[PDB]
Symmetry: D2
Subunit: 334 residues, 4 copies
């Protein structure tokens, strides 16, 4: 049994906890601490009530310094410097770093200085990171000597399972991705200063093109694809749920019907759970609270000669959060 701490009890921080309980505690861990900026009442409140995901099924409360979820008691800290955190005393095996501010191995290591054994960055890591994992694809690579890994991005986790079966059973020369993405909290309501002049613009009124390493990053979860994929994102005005739209050059001739079939039985077999399959006439909100990393949408496949276009829907919060649990385990028992 593994002992976990969450640093950053925000969209990904909390939804990892919510997914831990909504699953039924199958994952052989315990969440023992939780770090954010606010008091325990604040965290208790945001755990019980959510816009995107509704009210939390079970029972939540506070006990002075402790958040209590379905009987389990969880300490609530509010120290912004992770170096001075009591991870040693709590005897934490894995700190989930979900604040967005410590994404390099340099910065994330504060948790090792604090006294935690390992750390999972809820995001793409710095070049210096021990590893970058997309669970269900390359989680094998993990060794006990890995102390500071990355869990990739929500996009990367969606793209990897879409492309692997099509590269294996058809072959891809080159591919270009557009992901159309729900807005996130790094964006703004009405135009204000931001490091990126596009993310400086109102997220609720525009399509905002934005950079993302997701396509290239797949390159180094499936090394055989290294340097063969690029892409970018368009943020649109929705609260949650994204889609990946991949165009690629097939090595040989193919058809829509066949592309779909490869993806179908990929979802029914070796990628089951991770990769979903859809033929129904659904829209983005129908995948809200779907725990798949990637739900491929057969209804949108289009093939024109050697050029193939495929799409997959992903709950960028819920999909990614369920994988944070999976990858926490894998990392602890390497």
């Amino acid at each position: 049994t593994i002992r976990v701490a969450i640093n950053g009890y925000g969209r990904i921080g909390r939804n990892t906890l919510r997914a831990f309980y909504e699953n039924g505690k199958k994952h052989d861990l315990e969440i023992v601490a939780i770090n954010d900026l606010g008091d325990a009442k604040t965290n208790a409140h945001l755990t019980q009530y959510d816009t995107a995901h509704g009210k939390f099924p079970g029972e939540v409360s506070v006990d002075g310094d402790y958040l209590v979820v379905n009987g389990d008691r969880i300490r609530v800290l509010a120290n912004r410097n992770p170096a001075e955190l009591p991870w040693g005393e709590l005897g934490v095996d894995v700190v989930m770093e979900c604040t967005g501010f410590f994404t390099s191995k340099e910065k994330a290591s504060a948790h090792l200085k604090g006294g935690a054994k390992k750390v999972i960055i809820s995001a793409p890591g710095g070049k210096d990171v021990d590893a970058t994992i997309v669970y269900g694809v390359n989680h094998d690579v993990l060794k006990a000597e890995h102390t500071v890994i990355s869990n990739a991005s929500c996009t990367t986790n969606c793209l990897a399972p879409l492309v692997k079966p099509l590269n294996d059973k058809i072959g891809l020369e080159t591919g270009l991705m557009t992901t159309i993405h729900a807005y996130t909290n790094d964006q703004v309501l009405t135009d204000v200063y931001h490091e990126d002049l596009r993310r400086a613009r109102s997220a609720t009124h525009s399509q905002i093109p934005t950079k993302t390493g997701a396509a290239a990053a797949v390159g180094l979860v499936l090394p055989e694809l290294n340097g063969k994929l690029d892409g970018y994102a368009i943020r649109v005005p929705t609260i949650n749920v994204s889609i990946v739209d991949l165009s690629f050059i097939a090595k040989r001739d193919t058809t829509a019907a066949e592309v779909n079939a490869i993806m179908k039985e990929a979802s029914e077999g070796a990628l089951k759970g991770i990769l979903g399959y859809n033929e129904a006439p659904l829209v983005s909100i129908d995948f809200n609270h779907n725990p798949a990393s990637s739900t491929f949408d057969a209804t949108l496949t289009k093939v024109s000669g050697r050029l193939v276009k495929v799409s997959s829907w992903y709950d960028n919060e819920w999909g990614f959060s369920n994988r944070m649990l999976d990858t926490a385990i894998a990392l602890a028992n390497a």
Copy 2:
């Protein structure tokens, strides 16, 4: 001066009228008639005030059975049937069908019976019309013989100019399109009956995949790309402005900087005014009320081997409405 009317006075209707006045009436034209069925107080108010395009910078009022727009008297009508409108009494050279309900050719020639010498449809027409035109790309294929033509879709109007100089100087084996598109009035506010099951879902809260013929219909304006382009739309929660995202296989080797150069040149050349060129870090709302049919975005270009991704922004209402005016001219003045 070409004497012009409009039938259907909806978003396309009103914005075509507004387009004309906002330009400075620099089109050799005069809008002499408007044939919605809702009353005149209501249409004046919707001309004056608009959420997406803001307040009309001009004077709007009603004098009985008439509309006054910066001094000019627009005859309001109310006939359901196009065969018996007065048109030819008032010398109507070109009519504009913007309700849609009457899209095909035999229904459309009813305006000719009513007196009109020509007719422009503000939508894709049935496979049986004198032309489908994308102004600045193929409008030169017009003649005096032609009567009931099509001005295409907003999306086809954005795709054609995007693709031409790329096919012409690089060559395009095949392409697939996704247009990320603002919601429109056929959609719904909260899930309720619709003949399409995706469009029956709240427009304000989802990305909604929808079918569009606009990629195939590039064939009809650029014959050399018959069968080479396909695609669809994803409807998103914006009130206006849309982007065409195009992936295509190039016949030869290339770069992003070259694709960009070719497009800049084409924006300063034949398609000047119709096709724009952006290098600035802008978002969709920046292209709201931009009269271009297509503004290519050099910042978004990606080339990976022989696969090329280019994208162009379009105000799905405004650009198209400014082309309708361009088209109505070129229609009349062909032989």
Copy 3:
């Protein structure tokens, strides 16, 4: 046991069905028919998936001209003239009229012509209807003879339970209401023709003021407040859930604590189930899928001298829909 048909299977129609199944079919009725504009395939799809309320918890399938929900077979019709429609064949006890087009005894009686024995309008009716009902407050006025009734509006069902206990224990001279109301399907996505000049404007970008009879109507269900209340609505950019903001002159001195204590007592007693009570720091979306007709928000209470301001949240779809079932059971079993 009473046999019910839903006419108009939209926001209130489907959610009345959904409500009926999510409450474990405790109501002594069976839903035997749905009438709308599409086929069973469309009605089943919209029953199964929803933006505002998420995925239906049970099982929905299709079998020919029958929609099947949790094993119950429900016949799907698509005729937009109630006169026709086989209510006699199906032996319907109560039609729930939820299309928005038959909101008077005269108009809604077309269902009687079609074979049904009694009708509930899902909205304010004319003065001509036999009763206007807010369940929890005046349903005891229902009589065996009454054939066509009105269930009032969402707003009236929220306001009556708010105002009643305060007028009984404190006293109310006059009162004025504003309801900040989610948009509904009678509004538009981008500016376009409508009988109402403000509702002709995008629901997604504006606060839009509109009329409501709810204040006066609280007189009809609580005669002691005849002519004392007035008010209106402001439609805002949200997909569901609304609030009533009532201001009134108290007839004696009171405090915020007393006002809250009174309402807490009423929610716990005679109006239990119809009226909830909140003192948590919540926002509109937290009341989504709350079946109460009115959830008093004690945290928002304001008294200054004799002027009192109180607020109650309501799920305009879910509250009203649960009440439609309750009122059906009261209507048929009356006497």
Copy 4:
């Protein structure tokens, strides 16, 4: 001619700068400097483009240590300590203090030490400020000796002109306001930590109640109303524009007709420019970019006995920014 510096170039700063230029530089001042910690290029871009207010109708560019707007060159500084700023070297008569973190006379006086003669806070001030001003209402109170003043808040600037005529000519016992307010950048996109638990909730999907001291603050500028008004805000999903909804007990009997005449008279004389008057059937976005502090809406007035409800629209950004210019002038010229 007054030399004005802007400390803190967020939305308030930028919008104030734009209103100056968009009004044709009619105000007898010049903007000679801006102090902000962001980099110039970003601040230039955000001056040129805005979602809520659209594209600045002039030219904006950067040239070294200078922001350039319609030919005028504006020195850009980036120092967090205003004691060390060159205001005295620059001859700055009035700093507009727009940062948030200098709302006390004690703190603001750092600008005095830096060389500025006067400071106007774009926000309610601490107890120690020389005055609080709603332009058109109490700017007469400004005196030579005042060096650090408040311009109050956007809501107070809406409410004071609304209630002043009514109190003068009818009389107000007490009053309670709800202000239905656009969201601001102090809120969140999707639920996340905030010091207030309601603002921790998505602004884009809910009605969100929040405290404001803006009703009680009307006592600062209309001492006759001191202690008589209170209220709160409901934040709704719109990017800009808000409405003040005031309920009050009148001291004598009046009519809706009398209330409106009183406001029209006020708008055409004493408060001309600051208070507008609408009888048109308009919605919130039609007031976007309206520079009035308060536009009273005659169509919304209700009276029932001695209870009056009156509503006024305000662009909670543009109104306030225009008034900052007005007040800056009066402050520098005081006595």
